Structures are given as C-alpha cells and as structure tokens.
Swiss-Prot record, chains A, B, C, D, E:
Residues of the full protein shown: 6453 to 6798 of 7096
Site for Uracil recognition site, residues: 295
Effect of residue 261 to R: In strain: Kappa/B.1.617.1
The organism of origin for this protein: Severe acute respiratory syndrome coronavirus 2
Protein name: Uridylate-specific endoribonuclease nsp15
Gene: rep
Catalysed reactions, as listed in the record: uridylyl-uridylyl-ribonucleotide-RNA = a 3'-end uridylyl-2',3'-cyclophospho-uridine-RNA + a 5'-end dephospho-ribonucleoside-RNA
Site note Transition state stabilizer, residues: 291
Cofactor note: Likely affects Nsp15 binding to RNA.
Essential cofactor(s): Mn(2+)
Task performed by this protein: Plays a role in viral transcription/replication and prevents the simultaneous activation of host cell dsRNA sensors, such as MDA5/IFIH1, OAS, and PKR. Acts by degrading the 5'-polyuridines generated during replication of the poly(A) region of viral genomic and subgenomic RNAs. Catalyzes a two-step reaction in which a 2'3'-cyclic phosphate (2'3'-cP) is first generated by 2'-O transesterification, which is then hydrolyzed to a 3'-phosphate (3'-P). If not degraded, poly(U) RNA would hybridize with poly(A) RNA tails and activate host dsRNA sensors.
C-alpha cells in the first residue's frame, strides 16, 4: 500500500525509501514536504521538479542509491525510462526520466517493462537486479549495464566512473565500471569505440596522467615544447586567450583548472544539465575578458592531444566528428598553412 | 494507517472519509488535490483554509455528516474543539476549530477528550455518539447535544434548525432540534433564556408565522396598522428607507427579503463567517441608496416585535441587550418623544 | 512560429487560436495569464489544470470549436489522443487527453498520427476534416466520427447530442449526431448495441418523450398506473424516498428534475468529470434526507423502463449489465417475491 | 500598535525589531517580504517556515539576539513555548516553537505566562529579563536560565556554548554558560548529571583537549596505543571503515573531521534540525563506501573514551543509556570475547 | 516579433538575448522558466524579482553584457531608467530599474528616450552605443557614460572599476573607467569632486597601496606609529573593539578583512542592495561581541586616513559630510581633548 506518510516514514527512519512499514504526519505547503518532529515542522524535501510536490517526493525517495551511470551517459544512449528504479538527476534536482515503470502510481506507465506500452521506449535495465538481464533480452528497446559478461552479448566497457548519490567517483569499495549493451527494435546494437569524459570539478580538479601533471606544473612554452605541440594552437585552445574583449579558446576543463588557481572567473551554467559538452558564459575576473558561449569538455589531456594530432591540417575549415561518451561530438577545425588556428566543440 | 492516498480513496468511493481501506493516486499542486482517473487528473478538493493542503483535505473528508449545530451556536457557547469529529464550517470553507481530538494526526492534540490537555478546553460532545454523554459528565469544560432527556440534567431547548452538510434545515426525516447542556470548571450551567435567529436565505425566504406572512403580503401602512406598530419606526427599521444617499434602517432579514422580490441589491459580505448578527455593505440597485455597515439579523418577526415592545422608550439613546443564540447581542435604541427613531444591532 | 504572445494575440482578436499572426504583451502570474490593454492588465486565462500555465493556455486556445463527442463518449470508446485537435474537457476545465498530435510543441508526441509512436494509441479522427477518414483507414488503433456514410464500413449511430464549446446540445443549425467507427489492432470493430445517456441539466430539464412528459406532469400513483409499473419500485428508484435519514433511491435524473421544481437540494459532485454515471452526495433541504453516494444516470425514461422490464425478477440480488454510451454499466438489482426492491447503477 | 510596515521599519533601520516608531512601504509576494528603496523592491525576508509570510517575518524580526541555549538543549528539556521572546531556530530557518506569549498577535496564546492557558506548557524563562525568575516560580511548567544563583533553587550548570544569532560560541565578551532549572507540575525537578555535545562544524573543527589533538595528528595505530584503547574498536567506531560497500562505524564528529581533511565526503542532512545525535546519509568520495543512516555525535573525545571504557564488555549486545545534553541517549554495545565490536547511537 | 519562446531560444543557443531567429518549447511553473531538452525540463531561470516570471526572464535575458557602472553609482546619480538596455542588478537578482525604454513590451514606458514620457526621468545613456550621446543632449534629464571626450561636455572621471556580468573589476581587456555626465532639467550639472569606494569582497580582499599592505601585515601599534595615527582612534574605528558585548567601531572593510583571516564572523546583509555605505548585523564568532547596525565602507585606507586627518578635532560632536561615489555621505565625528573618540558613517 503506497502512501505519502509512508514515503515520509521511510525517509525519516531509513534515509530514503526502503520498503518499511509505517507512517508519519506530513504537511505539504506549496512545494515543500514537512514532517512534525516534537511540535515543529521540519523540512524533508523542496520540490525543484516540474512534477507535483508529493510525486517528486516519492520519486526522489525511491532514487537509486547504487552507483549508476551518469545522466550524460544514459542520455547519449537514448534512455527514456528506467526499469523499476528512479535514476535521480542530481544536477537538475529532478528525475532523469519523465515516467516510471513499477515505481510510482502517478508516474507509472507500466508495472513491468514487458507491458507493451514500454516496447517503443529505450528501457534502462540493471544487471545487478535479479531478472533484469532477461527483461533486456525480451525488450524491444533497451540499455543494459552489468558487472560481468552476459552469455553471447558483445559488451561495451563503460567509463571508470559512476554516480553514487550525486557523487561521481571511481569505486574502490564498490564497482562503478559497467558493461554497456543497447537494443534498437529488437536488435542488439554494436556500441561504437569511444572516449570518455573524466567528469572532474573545477574546484576539485586532480590530474590523471603525467601529461596532465606536466600541464599543471610547467609553463605554457615548456609543456608545448616537451609534448611537441608546436603548431597545434594549445595557446588558444587549451590555455586560453584573455587579451581581447572576447575570451579566446579555453575549451578543455584542465585549462580552466589551470587558470582558476591563479585568478578566479565566473562560469554561468546557463543550460544546467549533465552533458558531454558543457556551455558556459564565462567572465574573467582579472582581465574582464569574456565569451557568451564557451564550450568546455573534460577530456584526459592525453586523449585531447591524441585527437588533435590525428587531424589532417591541410584544409581551412572542416567538421571533425569524434565519438565521446558514446555520442558523436562535432568539432570545428580551423587551419592555416598547415598549423592549427582553432579547434573547438562546434556550437549547434 | 492514515494516508493521503487512503483519504482520497474514501472520498472517491464513499464521498467522504468512511474508514474504508484502499488507495488511489494523488497529486498535490499548490492548494489543489487531484486524483488520476483513467490517465487524467480530476480535481478532488481545493484548499481555501490556512492549513496545509493535505491537512485541510483530510479534515474536510472527515467532516461530521450528521445534522450538527450551526457554527454560530457553537461559537456563542464557547466551544473550542470537538470530540472525535470535525465540525466543518461551510461559510468559511474551513474547519470550525483549530485542533482536533482523535481525528487527524497533524492536528490532534489528544486521541480522547479524557486526556489532560483537553480539560481546559470547552469540548463539544454529541450525545448521539455512544459514550459521549458520559464523557461530558466527566469533562471539566464541555457542551453537549442530545436528542432526548439526559438523566440528572435540566436541558436547554435549542433552535429548530441544524446544519446538514452545509444546508441549514428544520429536519423532517432527521432530528435537528437538540438539547443543549454546558459545563464550566466542572459545574453544569443554567443556560440563559434566549431567542434564536432563524438562519434563512434571502433568495428562498419563507415566513414562519402569520405575522411574517402578513408582513410579506400586506402593504407597509396596512401591516403597521394590523399589529398596532405606530411609533416603533418599522418604516425605517424593518421596511428600509431608500430615499437618501445613506440607506436607512433595514436591519431585519425579512425586510431585505421583501425588498429583494421587488428590486435587487448588492450585499457585500465583508466578514464571511457564521454569526448571529451579520454586517453587509449594501447598495440598492434601483435607487442608489447604500450603507457601508448594515447590520442584519434574521429574527422571527414576532420575536423582534416582542423585543422592541419590551423597551423603555423614554431615553434618547441607550444600549439594549438581548440574549440571542445564547450570546449577548447589544442593540442601539434611539428614541424621541416616546417613539422609536431607530433600533439596530450595535455596530461594535 | 509558435509563441505565448502570438497565442494571446489570437485569443484577444479572434476569441480562440486561429493561425493569425501578431503579438500582444503577456504577463504570467502564478496560474493566470494576463495581457496589457491600455496600460492595465486584463485576465485572459486561469489555469485549472495539472499542466504548466502557458502550456494549458495554448491547448485551451487551440480547443476544437466544432461540435465534438462528449468526453464521456470518447473515454468509453478508449480514445487516448486526438488527431491535430484538442478536445477540451469543460467539466474538468482541462484537456481531455494528456498528449497531442500536431497541436502544441510542449505536449506533442508526433506531428502526424501516421508516426509510429501513435500506432498503439487509440487516435480520434474527425471525418469532417479533409483526409482524416483516410488516416483512420491506415491507423492501427482509432475512433472515427463522420456526418454521413463511409464507403466500406458499417456505421454505429451515435447520440443525438454533442458538445459545442461546452454546451451539450442537439444541433439544429449544425449536425451533432455522428457515425462512429472503431479499430483495434488494425481491425474494424462492430460496436455493441447501446443506449445513450441524454446529457441534460437539472435546472433546464426538458422531457423528450410522452412518457417523460406524463412523468413530469402526472402524480406518482397516476403515472405508475398509466404505464403498468406496479411492482417495479419506481417510488423508491425514480421518485425517491425522503422519509428516512438515508435518502432512498433517486437514481434517474428525471426524478431529481421533478423534485427540484418543488423543493431544492444540494448535489455535491465529488468527482467532477464527465461520465455516463454520476455519483453525488445529496442533501434534501426540505426533509434533511441525505445519501453519501447517490449514483445518477440520465436515461430516457422509456429506456430505463425497457431495461428494468427486461430483467428476471426472481433472484434476491444480482449484477445487471447494460451497454450505455458504448461502455458496460453494472447495476445492482434487488428483488423480493418477484417484485423489484431497488435497482441502481452499481457503486463500484 | 503593531503593524507589518512598522516591523519592516525596525528591520530596515535597526537590523531587527527594536520597538521604534515608524513605517516603510512593504510589498508581500508569495513568500517574500520586500521594501521599496529608491524606486526598486529590496528583499527583506524569505519565508522558510510553515507560518504565513507576514507572521514569520514578525517573529523572525522579534528573534532573541542575546546568547540563548541551543535548540537541541531546549528540546531535550521539553520546552514548548518561550516567555515574551522568540527563540529563532537558525538550523530550520523557523521559530523554535509554534506559539508565542506576548510577542505577536497572530501567534500569541497569551500576553503573559501567568495566564492559565500556559500552565500545561513548559514555558522557557530568561533570568536576564526583569521579572522572569518570578514567573518561573509561579509557572506550573517551565525551564529557566540565569547567569547566577537563584535563592534556594538548586542549579544545573549548562554547556559552555550558546547560540548568538545562529552562531554557536563560548562567550568572551558575553556570558553563554547558564544555570538551568526545570519545573514539572509545580515541582522543581532535579536535572540529571550529563555530558554536553560540543556543537562543532566539520568545516571549522578545532580540537579541545590533548587527546583530541593527538587523535588529529597521530596515526591510528599510534593514538590507539598511546591512549591504551586496544580492544575498544575505535578503528570501526571513531576512525571508520571505508573498505566495504557499507561504510562501517564513523560515529564521532572528530572522526569525520579527521577523514575530511584527507578526502571529502557527502553528508545528506535528511532530517535537518538541531539535535544531540544527528543522522546523515554519507557517501565517501574516495572509495564509494556509503551508509544510509549514519548516526553522528560531537562528544569531546575524552568524554567518549570515558564512556566506552566504563562499559561492561562481557555481553554480546546490550542497550547502554548515557545522559547527554540532559536527554537519555541509547547506545548499542556489541561485544565479542571481552573486546568491543561496535558501539553506536542506537537507531530508533 | 518578440516572444517568450524566442527569448528562451536565444538564452539556450546564445547564452543571453542576441536578436536571433528561433523558438524553443517553454514551460512556466510558478516562478521558474523551463525548457524541454531531450524529454526532460531543464531550468532556465528562477524569478527572484517582483515582476511577472516571463517578464523578469525577458529583461534578464536582455541584460547589458558590457562593463557598466555599479548600481550604487547609478543610484547615487539618480538614474531612474536606462535607454534601450537593461542594467541588471546582480546583488538583487533583479533589474536595476522598474521600467524600460525600447526593451520589453510589458515594461516599456516608451520605445525611444525622446518620447516626452521620458523627459521627467533621469535616463541612463551609453556613449558606446551609436546615437546615445545625442539622445543625452536632447534629454531633459540624464546620466551619460562614454569612453572619451564629448565635444564641449565637461567630464567627470569615474571609478576605475565597472561591473561585467555581476563581476566587479578593473578592466584589462576592456575599458571600465568612464566619463560621467549628468543633466537636470535640460542643464548639464557639474559633478562634484569625489572619492570612490573600492568594491572589494571580504573573501577576496586584496590591498591596493603600501599603507594597505602595511595595515594587513603590521601589528596594530606598529602601523599606527608608522603612519603617525596616534589620537585618531583607528583602534576603535578601523581595527574594531571586540572586548565588550557591543562590538565597537569596525567601519572600514579592510578592518573586517584583517579580522576575517584570524577568526570568522557573521555579517547579516539585512538590506541586501548595492550601496556606497553598507549596514550589517555582525556577530564575532570568537568573542560573541556583536552590533546590530554596523555601517561599513570600502575606502582605500589612504583615502580614509586623508579624510579623518583633514578634520577639526576641537568639537565634541559634529556631522562631517564627505563626497563618495558622487553622493554626500554623512559621518559622525566624536572628539575629546583634541583626539578622536569615534568617526563613523552616520546611521540615518
Ligand atoms: C533534501 C532535498 C534533496 N533534493 C534532491 C535534489 C538534489 O540534487 C538531491 C540532494 N543531493 N545530495 N546530497 O536530492 C531536493 O530537490 N530537495 C530537497 O529538499
Ligand atoms: C470540493 C470542495 C469542497 N470544499 C468544502 C468547503 C465548502 O464549504 C464545502 C462545499 N459546500 N457544499 N456542499 O466543501 C472546499 O473547500 N473545496 C473543494 O474543492
Ligand atoms: C477564461 C477561462 C476559461 N477556462 C476554460 C475551462 C472552462 O471549462 C471553459 C469555460 N467555459 N465556457 N464557456 O474554458 C479556464 O479554465 N480558465 C479561464 O480563465
Ligand atoms: C534574511 C533572512 C533570514 N532568514 C532567517 C532564517 C535564517 O536561519 C536566519 C539568518 N541567519 N543569519 N545570519 O534568519 C530567513 O528565513 N529569510 C531571510 O530572508
Ligand atoms: C540563471 C539565473 C540567473 N538569475 C539572475 C540573477 C543573478 O544575479 C544573475 C546570475 N549571476 N551570474 N552569473 O542572473 C536569476 O535570478 N535566476 C536564474 O535562474
């Protein structure tokens, strides 16, 4: 028997929804869920979604608390709905998907993914839950993660990191690297070879290779020589140009990371959602240099170097498609006299 | 196991809360409670109270659906709280009392009136409920209604009319005239002799006496003659004076009713609540005569006659005090040369 | 180029969305849509739906303004979504269907019903629109209305009445009686024989048969005589029993209508939606008789007679099933010694 | 004469309510109080309570700005209401108590604590305000703080820290250590001997003894030897076990403090209120180790050592009651072969 | 053609309003603007103003993204409205001015500043926009900024810093020091000689002279001797007195900056708006010293020293008017025996 007061009971006594018997008095006022604790109302939940307050509350309580793929990954694979769990988008404070299966009676389009309503949707399945590998086999459309081989299914090895309760991390006490599988129209699909973005914070940025350590420690000229990068415009692309009114380049998160420890800047996240390429309106506090749409990607610098050096430098301008986080990312490559002028995630 | 979804199940299937088991999907958006019926949301309750929406929804669902005293009667006797029921105030679209006893978890102060937190409050007991007559006996402060005699207690006979689901009616298939008994600090009270307002509507006003019939039928001068009312200013007080900018008199509901059938007027009910005396901002549409605060009471005309004929007409102005619906109503009485000038419920 | 301001221009100038070009200043405050007219704000739409205010505003602006089936008829036939129109549900002040097709960008699931996302949904096609008869032929699941014959398809004749801008009427200057055709999984259905509710109002109730006239005019005993209805409990079932605390019978709208003209009563419409059977919490103001869930259907009296006279009166109680408005309505039939005791739409 | 505009006046010109003459134009929109400053609206207050916006505003303005006991302390002593002041709960952004005495006409259950309505409630009295010691003597239920001896009243010495405007601190320019007194039913109650939690932040944690300094500086093995703690499971209890998927132990705030300066973690405060024991859903960023209900207490480590070493280690499992912040805190003590396995605040 | 969906389009694809063709689906719910990105609603904007949500959204999108004067400066010059741009107040999350000219059809009092409605208002003009110097010449009231000389107009050199997207900065890639001009009633006004506040953060405070570097590094006694400040009460005025319950002095932001790096304090910004003098309710965490209205100004310490030493020290108390940010700031100067007791921005 689901109820608001039982959802609330579970949150108060178990920290999330955990299937327990019980009820607690709840008051709902506008978009906030409160519970009575010793005479006074204590806030349990502020609805930040476009769902009704008591609905968002139930889905948030019912959020998956195992490590799970980052929303950008699910999105890039075309996931529409999850089987019998909620993937909570901690970057949006909302569910990652509009509807549920077997979670919540207001949002459920089905109780079980085998119901035919679910066949046109890409259902996300979790091989760590009993029975879910088999439901993927029977689903017309789906994405499946597992911790091991599935007999006959050709795997795609996922990123090292996963999200655990909004914290992105490479697991040591828990597994966060999954096999990925995808089906379109009953047909298992070959996933493409791909790079993976590293999901690091500007605040907490830590290098993950010698080349990255070198980039952070060395001066610009010295790194560019040491890694034989002359003619590839890392001065514009990665390090950034703060000399003009429009801020030049600065498209690699490590490059922002470098600049941040000298002087701060403002980054307006004006479409705040998880995604492989992010767009910020950036203002440099030291110089006043700025740029309205500054696209930024967190590639391991090794990977970025590998990507740009693979390029034919003989055309003035061309679209360069690179597979990253399973999606195809377009870059613009501008060349002159066989050297790179600029190379950036193409603004769409 | 109280829940939002179970209360909603009871509403949907039984029309009101009925102790049934079951659940239905509920969504709450601002102040409105919806349920899903075949995939579309159906509005089930709009909160018009100062309570949280889900709390108000439950108390409304749990309203007393038997004929109960009108709220004005309960306020006049000083009722603070009800025993194991909710008296719903249909004039305020809200509960009649702040707290509850054995009704709802967010608003309960106790689960039985015997608890000590209740001793100071005047608790309303309904003799029609097994065991409440005996709870009243052991209650320190309380008001009690019954349908027949209570052994060892002299009764006060109530109004003929009661409220059944917001309809004020004199019961023919059910009993609406109660016995009333009251206790302060352990001591049964003698309730004062009292008149009762008649609780009638302007639109569907019916006379309840030959004098009231004669008043609706006869012309002004005739009536005042037949009942020897020369010098009592019923022209001003009951018939109303619409010849000057400030509307004159018109303090008796029957006199509004008479006027309303010939020509309409606005009654602005600026403190919308149940009360023995109502104040209206009246605009007469035919003449433009108006009055900001026109106090109005629905007394049986004969009772109003009896009251006005029992006053000393020999002082210019004074306060005249009348027990009505068990409360003391002050009237201003204005006289000149031993005839009435005006006489109106005091605007205090 | 769809916009909030253009939809508002269309409302202001054409009364509804009409494809015109133009813009007007719009402000949105909570759930209300305003436009500026000579420097003051004029309210243009109050959202009473679970949709976002601007989304609801647009779907309402885009409502079908031709006579369309009543929502109860469409629900009974299982319509999920409409083709390139919005059926507006005037009893719920909301759209009849969750999603749209070719109507509004925030709610569209497709732009034409031929798209594959639509195949599973029962799509409502309006033969009066060029090309929709042929879209229905190629539709997997669908309901279709037409004004005249469709070649190669046997029709089901609908109710005489349709909804034009929330007014349910039998059309004299326009046609309201449609042909109905239905398809599940590619296969044209034979629609069942059915009665149709009459969709009439308590206030403005008109008879549509000599029996209905005789019922409104004659006294109870006379009528029951003229039509040989001894032993069918029309006293209880149609005329209503107001002598006990629980109101007795009163399940036929014509019987409410008769009572309403002599004395009034409260009908609490606690699930306000369009449905073939309505449940009301009724309080009779003259007697105080009442019933929490009084199920009410507006059947042509003669049709109700025909139904009750076609039952086996020889079992104490059983479920009686009747096709009405294309859906199966369960009735409880209660009998003793071969006469009817009661017979009411099942409270299920 | 109280008014919204005068409350607002005081806040603008005095920083809080200070009894001053004056008014300023105020606008209220939804839950925010604004004032006009030179043409534009400036936000004064966002209602975060379950009270009406203008009510919460007045109570917040009227908040006590002297050092006052922490809400957890008042709660543990059963305080229901304060005499002639508002204790503002800065952890809840709301008043610590539902009602007032002599503060606010919407929330006042009385003007003065001697009114009999107040007798069943534990009224908090402030010996630093004239007359309040005497009101405690006359109150049927109460908690009193003073800065010195009260003749005849046996004191309880309180914690060193108090809250001054939401900042918890041990006063140097002001006194923050009070005597505590409590009355139940007219009878002064012996307060129990008790420990006091230290109220430190994870962010700003500072040790307060050699043992705490040693814990922060030394390695685990070294401290455990230096303070002769073998067999007491500080490895699990205080230091924490991040090696498994469920995070083990970690129940002392200093232990979290230690871990925080190496690698960060997430602590969801999912019942956000002041209390002696706090429950967090914790995710370790380095390892992915997590635990849904991780109870944490800030005891001076000396005190924790004193507590655990006092225990009989010869039973597999037993509840161990310790008085802390005047309340009785239950611990679970799990032992094996005369050494501690675990010891944690019992989850209720 | 303006529209909500086109404003939203520009924000999504350009980071702000940029005049581009296009539309995106938008949902508005209460005070938040959302757009659909791949099935889910992404928040674009939370209305923090007292304007309607979709209005504030448009004005915020249309905010000036060039360096512009700080709101405190515009306010001190009496600016009421801007010509054909929005100055966004990032400290209030709202437009700096109530109305617009040529920006937004809901807020526009005119299309062009020459319309006579604009003549009584001080219109802000931006010499960097074509045609705006000339509109200032024709305006009856106005404030104009330029980057260079305007023929015949006697300039006032502004502060070195400007606001670029909420970041206050002295421009290196962009110009942030403007000429200022003002007209009252058709008459260009002499702007006064003035000091300028430095607009630094407590968090990010950086000295800007040897004297400031000395103040931060030296001990109190040493600086006061080195800069020959005996008798001027910097001990009270600048350094602050935390020894009593009322916190003494502490009126220079650099003085707060000094204290902050030793021990933290709380500063309640209780009128949160940009202004030359700021008022904080300050609580010192170390000592519990506090003060309800502590006025603070960020003058370059050199300037403050220059100001106080200019004073006649022979009167017990006098108002001392100093021009700062073009406005006249009142100080109270309290002297005794020819030495300063206190000197603070006069509380009004
Ligand atoms: C307590 C609470 C939580 N959330 C949701 C969205 C946030 O990303 C996430 C919390 N992240 N962590 N740790 O949960 C919310 O929306 N409102 C609330 O009142
Ligand atoms: C359906 C609904 C009902 N009520 C309450 C208050 C009214 O006095 C009463 C309705 N009166 N009658 N018969 O019920 C409400 O407040 N909101 C709602 O949405
Ligand atoms: C003007 C306005 C209209 N409606 C909708 C729902 C109602 O059924 C219908 C009006 N009925 N008729 N004729 O239109 C709404 O919901 N809010 C509004 O502010
Ligand atoms: C200015 C403002 C303050 N408060 C309340 C709750 C916070 O704990 C406290 C502020 N704490 N400090 N310093 O006051 C609020 O709720 N809304 C508001 O707009
Ligand atoms: C994204 C967003 C922004 N603002 C406004 C007010 C803030 O000062 C400014 C953002 N400052 N920076 N970088 O823009 C807002 O009010 N709501 C919103 O949802």
């Amino acid at each position: 028997a689901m109820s608001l007061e039982n959802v609330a009971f579970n949150v108060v006594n178990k920290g999330h929804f955990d299937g327990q018997q019980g009820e607690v008095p709840v008051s709902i006022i506008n978009n906030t869920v409160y519970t009575k604790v010793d005479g006074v109302d204590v806030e349990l939940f502020e609805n930040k979604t476009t769902l009704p307050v008591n609905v968002a509350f139930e889905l948030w309580a019912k959020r998956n608390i195992k490590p799970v793929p980052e929303v950008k990954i699910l999105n890039n694979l075309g996931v529409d709905i999850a089987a019998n769990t909620v993937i909570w988008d901690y970057k949006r404070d909302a569910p990652a998907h509009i509807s549920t299966i077997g979670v919540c009676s207001m949002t459920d389009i089905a109780k079980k993914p085998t119901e035919t309503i679910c066949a046109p949707l890409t259902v996300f399945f979790d091989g760590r839950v009993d029975g879910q590998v088999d439901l993927f086999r029977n689903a017309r459309n789906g994405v499946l993660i597992t911790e091991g081989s599935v007999k006959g299914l050709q795997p795609s090895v996922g990123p090292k990191q996963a999200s655990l309760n909004g914290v992105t991390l490479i697991g040591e006490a828990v597994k966060t690297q999954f096999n990925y599988y995808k089906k379109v129209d009953g047909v298992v699909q070959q996933l493409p070879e791909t790079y993976f973005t590293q999901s690091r914070n500007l605040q907490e940025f830590k290098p993950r290779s010698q080349m990255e350590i070198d980039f952070l420690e060395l001066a610009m000229d010295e790194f560019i020589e040491r890694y034989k990068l002359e003619g590839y415009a890392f001065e514009h692309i990665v390090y950034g140009d703060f000399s003009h009114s429009q801020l030049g380049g600065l498209h690699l998160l490590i490059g922002l990371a470098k600049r941040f420890k000298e002087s701060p800047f403002e980054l307006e996240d004006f479409i705040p959602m998880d995604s492989t390429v992010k767009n910020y309106f950036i203002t440099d506090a030291q110089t006043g240099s700025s740029k309205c749409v500054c696209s930024v990607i967190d590639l391991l610098l090794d990977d970025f170097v590998e990507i740009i050096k693979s390029q034919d430098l003989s055309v003035v301008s061309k679209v360069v498609k690179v597979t990253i986080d399973y999606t195809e990312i377009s870059f613009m490559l501008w060349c002159k006299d066989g050297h790179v002028e600029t190379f950036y995630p193409k603004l769409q």
